[model samples]
Target: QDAIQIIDENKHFNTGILDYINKTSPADVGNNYHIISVFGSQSTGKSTLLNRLFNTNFDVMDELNRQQTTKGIWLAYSPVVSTTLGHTTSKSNILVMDVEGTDGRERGEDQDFERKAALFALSTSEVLIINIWETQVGLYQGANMGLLKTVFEVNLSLFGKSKLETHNDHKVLLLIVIRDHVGVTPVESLAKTFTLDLQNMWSSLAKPAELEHLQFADFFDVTFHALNHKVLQPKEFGEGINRLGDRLVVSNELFKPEYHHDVPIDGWTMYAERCWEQIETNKDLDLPTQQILVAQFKCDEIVESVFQEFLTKYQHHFKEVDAAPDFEELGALFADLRQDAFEDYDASASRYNKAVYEQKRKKLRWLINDKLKEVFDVHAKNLCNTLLEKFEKDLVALKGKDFAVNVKTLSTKLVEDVNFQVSLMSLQGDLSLDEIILALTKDIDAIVAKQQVVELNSIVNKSVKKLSASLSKSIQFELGDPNEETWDNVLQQFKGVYEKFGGDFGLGTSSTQNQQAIEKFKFKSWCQFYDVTHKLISREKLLALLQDRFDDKFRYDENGLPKLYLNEQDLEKTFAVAKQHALQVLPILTFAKLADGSEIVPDYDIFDSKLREQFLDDEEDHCFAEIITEQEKLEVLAKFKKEVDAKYIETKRSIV
Candidate 1:
């Protein structure tokens, strides 16, 4: 059946086939036909040649207009659409990629696209179809040769200068379809000249011995075809096309080389991988286009390679995981699939791309992994929630059957076993702290990087711990467990704590005080034990976990007292304590005294005030003698006593 129909029906085998086909082109439909890419300078009639060979209708720009038809890489299958060609049906798909010509004319500031597109195609394609006109063969001074130099340089950097035999072994076919072949020189002479040019080019390459012996026929299988231009007589062109089409028909030995060498395929791929590494990682070079292409190619390869590896370990689990019921069965399989997929992906990509590859791979993985994760996570969610509910209900129902021990053990075993089984599906290899961090942090940071809540503490801490634990020798940062569930719980619980007390736990509260004062204090206290465990793992490295949780406030006081500013609650508590002490002091100060008049004095000077006034009116000196009246002294004393009573009463009221 056709690949499209199989994909539509959702058959597993067919689905896999469809994925492979979609990744390639129709020309490479037969078995063992490897994917190859043709890349070079513009106006080289790459499109025309590809059309002739693959029976494709890729849009070709008008000759006079000088417009480029291909803007990026386009895939086409080989015209050899037969399974017997590659000697293996398992290798049925060979995608021929037609990359856009380098825009050297328009973009002079950088030829980055040329380097990038070429590298991307070269790295992924099993064979590189180098397309060049025959006339430009020996001219090292020509632009086409310059482009070839770029291709060679990229290949060297990717595959490394140390693996020449390996590179030449998995030869890239220089399927030179000579255009506008004049009858002056024999085709044989042209081939010889081209071969010499390739050798010269190889000699010019500054590579190590292992990568130095790149010969035209050694790393490539040379093929030549003569074609008449459309500008020539239409009848002759038609006749020539018929002859070419006849050559394309399922002919025996069409792809086989006239001469064979014992070069290792691994070496060639290694060379390509090395070149990709150099282009992707060079700090001094700012090849954005190249970086993006490498990211896409390597990332995609990472996903596929990892998934392919993962399929071997847990295909049976997936096949069995979907057995029981509704959407959940399908869901569980995918969830396991994604987790396994990424773990292995992270490892393989890191291996290929080196350190930088890990970061870029994580970015690429996150985008697709999340989507897959969501699908599976939703499925896992259904199963987990349902199972949890049923399990709880079952535990409650079996109250008389030694319920606590039996139920606890059963639930723990089932969950642990399932999780363990799932975990086992991961790629079993040692990874660096940075690589581990790259994968996990990207997964988390993508979702919660800019969140207002500081709940990332748990995730950050756990991620750091997981990374640190991978250190070969002991390191201080290795302070957390790598357990995903443990880390997840820590993160979620911390988020809850922050939500509850983030605002209230302000400045001046010591870290220890904040830890003690946090509500659900018991849970947080237990969490503190987990934190200590992490610290213990890292050789007792102390970091300000509590301070971070409390929004960076709080410090140790000089007196060792955890002093906090008075909030409403603190003030209320203090007031209640002080009021009890005041009651004891209240009894000591209260008193009342009754007023009693002394015995009334005799009124001998009854007209004293009027007499004094008359004396003063007569003479100022006589007024003092007249002032010894009893009534005048009594008036002064009464006025003074009234003033003292008023002042004393005011003071008593004010104090109360």
Candidate 2:
């Protein structure tokens, strides 16, 4: 609405202009807006021309105050008091900049100022409007002809330092309006005469070698307009303004893409200031360089905004993932954060320059991955703990049955679980997760091996318990009746159940896995078996069996009654026969012989003292088994003789 000074008279850009433009936030217009600026000799009514075209309120000259009006570059918002310029699909506004009038008559540093403004206008303006008096058209030096070359020379110089490859880039339309046309010469003849002057002006420009092949048409589309004196022919002048206004409309091809530069509205002011800065500073001015600069600046902003959003999202989702106990499932969630982060970056950053967008995209990816690893390390251990709990529970349960098969099943499950968990842990193929998986595998192996043998030993203790119960029961019953075959039956019972346990759970040396478990189990059970048997058959028990047998014959009758023998000779002979038979039983009982006279004690061979060098833990005996030596046998017989003879004498004295 109001005029904002873009560049001050000191040739300095007014940064204050940024505050005004930013307040209304025209930056939202994006590439939808247009910029048009006027540059010409001083006091040609350039300001009035712009005011009439766009209905702007730029400062104009008065006859009473006949002097230069515009001093610096001024931009009007064109609140668009009128939309006469045809149909617009959007709220597209045309920004008009009334550049300061150039005075070629002033010369020197002022010429430099003119050159700077010319380059700036050519760099951005979609259309160039040149106004001249009709009388000024055909003269050699008329209508400030030297200033035309200045405009053309600066236009050519801008391309020298630019990256534009062809003549098609940023071609401007030059609308030459000849004022004060008295209708003397035909419009076509006047247009032809103006064309000759433009050709001569372009030919005089010191073109850069790279652009020497180009003509004025290659850079600008030249058109012409003639208007009568504004005061003398007010109706025609008004009608003429309307015709020019029609071309400036949104529907007109007057402002093609090649004519306008694409700058996001949000950053247009910043770009304009930089362009002015370069123009004011050096002739090595590059509009292309500033385009890249603005791209990087805005792209950085986009990257920062989305990346922070990405960080917030990552942390927010992290809490949810952390609560989850599954590694693979949580890993799946973590990948989504990264995917969405990249996509967020893709949508916004792609609007900037290509190289800048790509560069920042990769940087954001690296940052996301770095954060991902940190989260992964913590979750990995969480998975490990849960998996270990499962392993321990199953570990205690397994091997109580089939040690080999159970070990195989649980072992396979653990490894497969480890593989799947590790697979899920790797966000990408780049992560080195095998080391963690290796540790997990070793952890399972260690626990499995240790617990396996522990369970195997417990199970074996149960089997040996059977051996002790069976053998103890057999020895207790058989010897309670004082039999000669009791030792043989007890030994047979021990061997039957002992070997049965070994075969039941594949606890033998035949299999690869549980052999050691079974061996250790077998060895400990062996010690317990021998201890039970030795305690069962004592010396007193053996001699008492002998004395009981002697009493059965000498002191009692055969018919289950007391002794009836009255004769001394009968008693002596009967005592000797019964005592001898009792003594025979003593030898067998003490020695632990079977019915066939073979020893009942095992050799304890497989548990040899050479290779394994294993021995019983608590107690030791001469037999290394339940049986005693020959000296113990003979001493037991002496005891049996002493106790039985007394029984024989007592029976003689008390016989019937």
Candidate 3:
């Protein structure tokens, strides 16, 4: 097919060039695509040379009426051709550009298009072919040198800014093709002359500070080629064109590493369009600016495509995997997905500006992380819930014996579980490790708080039941004689029970168990003790003991014999004496005191005051005791007196 017109004579890009490239060949936009443009004076056979070299039929100037044939620029794909010698095989998708000739007679006194076209070609093309006559090799004042000067001056003026330094350092292969070569001069001598002239031109320009120390060789690598006159030596001309084709095909020398513009084939149309726009407007034609714009566009395009694929494959997986048992493996899979998506993006987009690529890559990672965070948050919440339920169940099953060791072991296991899960997520750098740990720790502490209350209550209830059972048995045995020391002995045993389990109320010795736990423990223990003691020494039980005492002294002798005869006077005396001893038990039980009027039970104020001082730094009141008031004591004694009087009268009647 004929070459596609990329730009019209009005210096505007043809939008159809993109469609042409898309449909023409197996266009691998990412790889194996190279761009070459030819530059020379008007009617120099540049299109004819490209046609012969690349096997394309671009229109050439009429032999009789020679004028500008190529208006702006035209592009064509290189045809597949095998050389006889097979020296240099052509790379696939080699694109050739036929740029409009410079120093045209039609565009009289208007060198503006010449300079604009030169800049556009240099900005986009990798290998720039400077087509010139062999006779004009040493002519420094020729039209070819004038075009070369324009290209050099425009390159410095456009790429002088700091932002374009990277593009400025890019290398272009300036392949000087000398047409109509005779036997007078060697190609090497002509190449040296051209290099010297370029050096002289570069030295004369007003270079930027960044480019002051740089030589022409830093920006352009020079190569030379000689072609025979097309009319006089047609066979040699054919061979020369074939040799040039060989260089393009088989050798890496023509396509230098520095010549690669790092622009993808898909981006070429847009890049060239913007380059022409800058040239037509006489704006600063910076390649880096164009590259950054293209980078942003392509990166966003890739992000959309790749991110959609990720969402399609993993969106539902995110929900399902939150409750998955193998959450660690699920997290790793998410990380792998992110990495693969990014790698795919870099394969296409990383060919643009480095800074722009990095910035866009960071944004892409952030977007992916946002989705991952949704999954991570759900996973963390599920883990917390699972741990809390398991902990409560485990605590309920615990035997209320090992308070300290059990709490420590359970806490360690829970923390370790949380740590393991967090570590799995932490392998990727998206989530905050500290934040996750803090949240989990707070949840664990809350669970532990509730469990501590459950454990302490369990301990108190079990201990109270045991003490009550033993107290009931001892009270029954001691009531056989109802001696003076009976109530005192029971009170002593109560004190011993308190001392035995007081340490258990402390629960854990670890300082991490806050004062609230200790205070709650103390309050529960105090209530249990009060309940057990009151059940053992009720008004009805005390009255029965008083009856047993009166019967033991009045009905039985001092030597354990029953009295056969009893007068009212003797009975009254014996009743008075026995009742005095029995009534003494009332004062002891009522006041919780000893025979010497000293307090029997620990003082409510003193005991709780010490507990508060030791455990509670803040002055907060707690229900620590069941205090006995004087009114309650008087009520108990009255009930005891009524039961004893009724029993005494009944005993006297039985004797009569």
Candidate 4:
């Protein structure tokens, strides 16, 4: 199967003379590097022309022949085969795209293929070979115009002004391959007419935001070529077509500014957008577009696929292991792996086909996993060392009633460190839909079954037991077993103190008979005594003796303080600035009345004795008090007299 054959092989009859001079390898051929796309309505010989030009088999489906060959978007690579080795030259890397036909008769009511084809070309190719007949050039409402409109719009979507800095660095030439150039109209006249039509079409466009800055010429460098019908006069057609091939080779001027005239691509993309508005929401009109949407769609798929493999390798080496490690260490190791693997794979697979890229991608995956094995082993050892250091630090700093609570909290913190390390390692793991699903599914199941709760509970118990033993060793000197006689002595002294103070000092155990024995030997009982004694010392400066035994036996000066248990020294410094005041205050105020029977209130005199004396010494005070007394007696008599008068008045006024 010939991958590429020049379509105009038979069109050039003077070939014998030029065979030696033009004997260029397909891969070495300068024109082979350029990308060209064939687009038109169905049965317009779009596929046939491409097949003839490239000498490659492209599916051709004509309704007249009851065949529709091309489906969706198909890409073929033109590799210049070395005649000597029968292998492709490394430099020959031209890609040709065959787009599905646009007529509704073959592809149903779907017109979406045109937009998709345009988008694909815009993203990947540098040239678009617009195959149209000269007769169809001015048909304003023709299928060709519709396809052109789609091309223009999709170009706006791909490389508009917003993306100019990013996708802006290049240009695509519109090689208008006008087929069947009839002699009735001169080629130049037809070309001028088409250019005018294009300008008018651009003027009618509603340009998108990015396209607003571009003119038609900005987006596309235009060139024109007319070909005679090969079916009618094979000899003349052959000559014209061969000349076209010869002119297709690479030239230093391809990227030059002069060819484009700086007209801007804004109008072209705008023109495409108008066509999209008519069919954007119509599903039937979108079938063709859907077929070619795969380049973007599949490119994303490839990213996901490759990333999933990366995550699998990462999770297996980092997360699934039981060797708990430090986050920073794991992170550093993971980062190295990621940087190495991605660079290696990206360098190899970036410009290659999907299948070839996949193979190289798998090889990189193996390399990453091998590196992980060595890295994880070292990190796991570091984790073990870290765990030991943490355990020792905890043993020295906790004891008694607080030991369990502090240990549980510390366990949670330690586990968090473990999770951090695992998560840091995970940064190297490129996540994909499949791996994400797996991780999420595991988390969901754990949540549904309450597995996390079970795991946490187990850890809590383990931490409590471990911390208890460690704390016991840490405070052994202070909590050693008390002798029976010592316990008896302690109880006797406590009772003596209670008898002297009674409940006023708030010291009396409800479990009187067993109190001393329990307090002497049990850690919790001893801690309670220590707490109450310290509080008393803080309130009265009376509990200092308890510290003599506490400070000496616990090595308090050397070990510092246990976190949860509070003794006298801890509260003494805290309570040194205490203040005391009377709980309640009584008011002192005097009242008097004026001679006219109104009560006279002293003016803020009670608060100051001098002010009170000044008011009290006045003769008006006595007069005021006497008047108030008299007024009170008169008020009581007036109430009784008014009741009697009301009865008299009622009897006198009644007309019985």
Candidate 5:
């Protein structure tokens, strides 16, 4: 029967009232709710006026006793539904608060509760009904004017630090209700006198630093109403109350956008509690801090709802894709789910404080990124392993055959796979697409380089073996003759064999620099040729061939026939001439020389300066024609001479 007690005598908020409102409030309505509160001195009929206008049954002070009836704050829903003149239905569940009167004789020296209750009502209410009497309108020192001064001072202290401008949509409407009006002074005159009194009161208060120049309209939209004495002009009073109700329900001017605080119904309990707590503690009742708290609470609620929906949907999707998830598809799905969740969150949470909204929005993104990253890490690990196995096998098959091209092609494919996998994971946050690809390519390159080195070494060995055989054949065929052009002929033959084999060597031809390739090929070829030529024509073999040449010259005549009639003199002369010719072959064999007598053992220098420099630097093991030193050549000539002398003695003894 009695209106709900929202604030008790202890200055504590009744959260049960909010619970009741939530249970009884309409579901289809958004934030289209309103709050109207009345304030004045004790025994001012504030509760009776609210009851008459809103069809609410609130307790009024007893006329016989003339005592304070309302304690702290009473909240009740308007019973009647009213429609505007333009046929617009007024908001349902019009909440009305009947606040305790100021200057209560019962509370003697206790004005703290009155100020706190007033601050609480002003912060949450959209419409503030300042009930006053017309006879006391011009009396600046009246108790009613004193109450108004308290309201103004408390308002500045509470909302002085608010970031919102006075003209913002969060402004409060101040409706001055003049009760027991007399016909001597018109309502306009009363309003003018009341406005002047309010100005004087405002000037008398200690204003906040930044609010020194603030005008009345900056904080409130003032509207005055005149009501006849309830006993003398009861019919007129009823008519006037009905007209006020109509204005409350229908007039857009009565409830402008500036008059409403956009507090959601669900958060009203906590917001009211916090506001009352701040007021009771005598702390600076900062509406900005209260608004931010409400925003944080509401935003957290929205985030929970949104995140739950995402979790359910994501879990289902993950279950479906757990076996072999396609990262691109998965990533697209993740992005879509994240976007949908944010959109839903924005609808509800965006109505709160903007600073809180932005902060919460960032938190929401971080949570989503964390969720995606969990599954993405798994996908990346699996993908990396799978790709590595496949790439290794493919690289092995590609060995010794265009390996550079193969590695590049393989690297590209793996990189694409990495990108696709990253996309499917819906990768965001610290890990980027290009970064993942680059990491994958680096890994693949390492594998390729290691395998490539093995393959290259094998090719070099095979090439050296083949070139050795070819040079041996060339040396036997081209260097057998004792002609002036033989050394030149052998050098030319060496070049041909080198070119033929070097082209197919494959050492430096695979994706390497041309100059490097050439140097590598030339150095290897020079070493191989030197080794092969020395092995084919060793010092023992050279000595045998020299002795054989001398013997053939001595045993045969000028016509290539064997000489039958020969004396010691003939044998000696033939031996001497054959020995001279055979010794000439020694110098030619020791030093690779042209017909002009220019030495050619350092033949690599004449062919290529770069190769020649390397050849000389490593001339110890890789001397080809220069294998027989000057001292070694002299030893060969002496050994051949001794052998020729022995053959001459045998032939001369046979002739005798």
Candidate 6:
């Protein structure tokens, strides 16, 4: 409300300076602003001079009471609108600082405050106005001596050897405005006396061992002016202040480029605060050192501030991104949120020292990459899995006559997909990730090799299943019409099914297909083939086959009628013939051997995870028909013989 009391009497920074910069267009000012601070003995009317020049509302010296008016440092933005009546001013924001006077009549033992205040002013200001009475110019070892010498002392402190080499022209315009002057003294004469006294102060003052060769000109670029007393020669004093104000507003050379602190307007308030803090606590402070210090400090704060803001605002948005099964959508979403924070850093942080800003900018740039790392990391892993899923499915369903899978084309595209997505996630461009892309490629190749096997095995299992089903049908038809010769027919049918369906399969297992997968198919298919034959020949079907053989032989004789015989001897002997016929076929059914010496069942290991059943020995055939013996044959012969005798008696009755 009143001008911003930046540093109170207690030497504490006022937080309200932050609000003032915001309303005064920090964005508009950028590095276009200038700071002018006035220092002089007690009640020298420094505050009055500023009010007249810039039209600022700084606290004024009491002309009647002449007590200390400005207690600590006060700051105000200049060129208040013409509505309040103001000077013709530069559109560039001009900030004015009114420091408490130097003499400390009100608070005497005050050497610390004035020296501390001077260091802060020389570090921050483009122009520092020294307001003194013309009458006090010749004093030695006095208050004016103290004021001028302290300014020189702080400049050396601010631009010591380390800073002097780095910023050789690190200069501030020291405008010496003499009050209540007469033409008799001559402005040139007053300037000469002022220079002589300043030289004496520089010679007597202490210099760092490294800065003995440095002169006063290396630190400050100075100018001289004289103004009459504000009351006695009010018009001339008023005119002099106007000229200086106009020189400040319109004269390009008054605020030289070398004098600028180079701090961004948005960072000015905080930069100003830290300069005082460094002074108040006493550091071997330098302009370059302070600028770099504030650069890293504020840059980190600002970068992370925007970081936190973007995270909270887009928290739900990231949820949607991570949940998406596709990775490309994430690129756009990540880029949008990521760009805002980077631009935010650039605007607020670009005002700091260039070397320091560039260094901190590198950190900010990588920070986005890490933020994107989660998105890109997840996408890389997921994109790989996704590509394999489709690739494997294609290999399994490979339908073309000669086509085969190598994953070369698909792998290239997938790798490109990763790099492109990485590019987008950078939010700002030139994000480096050659290592990460290579990593993704390596992972995909490993999966590609493994997936080829899974899909190949899958193809074989599918073909073998179909081969088994087809063989089962053919074996069933042959067994329905039993003969010892039919065993060879069953064998041929198995060969047919395998050659047609299982051999080449066009699955390209043969194309790039290794022999192992092929062998696995053939062996497993044979095992399934044996199972089908065994299931079809259950005990019920076995007995039915035997009975059908008996009917074929004796149910109707060769005479084409039901054979009835008078003699039990004839009927009994013939019954044995039919019984023997059914009994003989049982061996062929139980001991099914291929017509050639080739084994009827598989004689080798069936597949991996061994089932020794396929390689059964002589000891293993016991289950198929091991119980076939004399008693079982005798029982079948005896049961049918009784039927033959009963029919024999019935035949004689039919003849009568």
Question: Which candidate leads in TM-score?
Answer: 5
Q: Is candidate 3 or candidate 4 better by TM-score?
A: 3
- Candidate 6 structure quality by residue, lDDT tens digits, 1-656: 35887888878888878677558654566777778888788787888877777777887755577577888788888763221223574766778888888775666654567666766776778888888788888875343686556556655655454463554245888888888886678888888988888778888666777787878777778898788778878877777776666666556448767877676765767777776766776643222334466677887888678777766766566566556454446656666676777788788878887777788777876776676676666666666576657755654465333333335556677678667765655445544567677777777666645655665676677777666666667665775576767767776766765655445533334344555666666767656655655566544455455555666556576766766565566565776685566567555555456665344546444433456443222444433223334355346555555554454455446435
TM per prediction: 0.34, 0.43, 0.43, 0.36, 0.44, 0.43
**All candidates: CA RMSD (Å):** 34.5, 20.8, 19.8, 28.2, 18.2, 20.8
Candidate 5, residues 192-279, lDDT tens digits: the string is 8878877777787777878788776677677888899998999888878777877877664587666655656656657678767767
Better of 5 and 6 by TM-score: 5
Pick out the ten consecutive residues of candidate 3 with the lowest summed lDDT.
Answer: 617-626
lDDT of 1 by residue, 1-656 (tens): 11121111111112243344545443423234455567666777777666655555555778678776676555454534322232222223434567777655565445665666666665555545666555655556343565566566656655543344342234545655555555466767777776677667766766655655555455556565554554655454444445544443444333443211223333333443455456554543344444555666777766667756655555455434344544434445545665766676776665544545766556655554444443344334444555555555554454334433553475565465434432332223111123322343343333222221223233334433433344312222221322223324443543444445433422222355344344333333333433443344221121222112122112223375543545545423433332332222212211101123222221122224553332223433323223223454244334433433343344244324
> What tens-digit string does per-residue lDDT give for candidate 3 at 92-119?
5778898888875888556667767777
Off by over 4 Å in 1: 1-31, 78-94, 141-143, 160-169, 209-217, 233-249, 257-656
Local error of candidate 2 at residue 164 (angstroms): 45
Question: Which scores higher on TM-score, 3 or 6?
Answer: 3
Residue runs of model 4 more than 4 Å from their true location after superposition: 1-32, 61-67, 78-93, 162-168, 250-656
* Model 6, runs deviating above 4 Å: 1-344, 347-352, 375-488, 492-514, 518-539, 553-580, 583-590, 596-602, 605-656
RMSD in angstroms between candidate 3 and the native structure over all alpha carbons: 19.8
Q: What TM-score does candidate 4 get on C-alpha atoms?
A: 0.36
Considering summed lDDT, which 10 consecutive residues are worst modelled in model 5?
81-90
What is the Cα-based TM-score of model 2? Answer: 0.43
